[PDB]
Chain A
């Protein structure tokens, strides 16, 4: 694995990893954090019916 990081990175709010190739992402509209679709178990197909995504942390 590569050492260091890209300063213009976006870290997933669940796994804390950087964005990679051909990955589906979704952003919470309340805290503006980004998440892997795989990490929050949300497919692109499901996200199409989501008007305003609210991450698990903001859903408490």
Chain B
């Protein structure tokens, strides 16, 4: 599936 994990600060 087209997924994504965003970065931390």
Q: Is the interface of A mostly helix, strand, loop or mixed?
A: loop
**Interface range for A:** 10 to 19
**Interface range for B:** under 10
Q: B8 to A22, Cβ gap below 8 A? A: yes
Which residue of B is nearest A46, CB measured?
Answer: B1
Q: Is the interface of B mostly helix, strand, loop or mixed?
A: loop
Q: Which of B1, B2, B5, B7 has the most CB of A within 10 A?
A: B1
Which residue of B is nearest A28, CB measured?
Answer: B2
Q: A53 to B1, Cβ gap below 8 A? A: yes
On chain A, the residues within 8 Å of B1 by CB distance are 26-27, 29, 47, 50-53
A21 touches B (CB below 8 Å): yes
